[PDB]
Design brief:
This protein has five helices and no strands. It is an all-alpha fold. It has a single domain, classed as Histone Acetyltransferase, Chain A (Up-down Bundle). The two termini are 21 Å apart. It comes from Homo sapiens. This is Bromodomain-containing protein 1.
Length: 121
Amino acid sequence: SMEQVAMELRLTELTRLLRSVLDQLQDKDPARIFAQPVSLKEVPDYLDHIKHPMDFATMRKRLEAQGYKNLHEFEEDFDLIIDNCMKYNARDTVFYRAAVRLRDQGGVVLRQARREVDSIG
């Protein structure tokens, strides 16, 4: 149907916008602390602590499968990165501190992407 096509084109454009958002968020993590999943070889007990792991590579796979239906779903995954880190790691660690900075600096990027998604429909 012509309707399924137009829907598909909207999803493609949402994907294009979220890709740019993701690149901007990932630049706020220059140390690459959140680039890849926490290694279960190196932290064998991680899943006893964190029930829903998340990282920027796993978000990127989901993105390119057009697996995000809206900005809210994307933000949920971004928030998991930060919130998992802040529970697993103590306050006085390079890891926790990096999460706090990513959170604070991402807020600006997400503030405007919420307006661009409402604006462009």
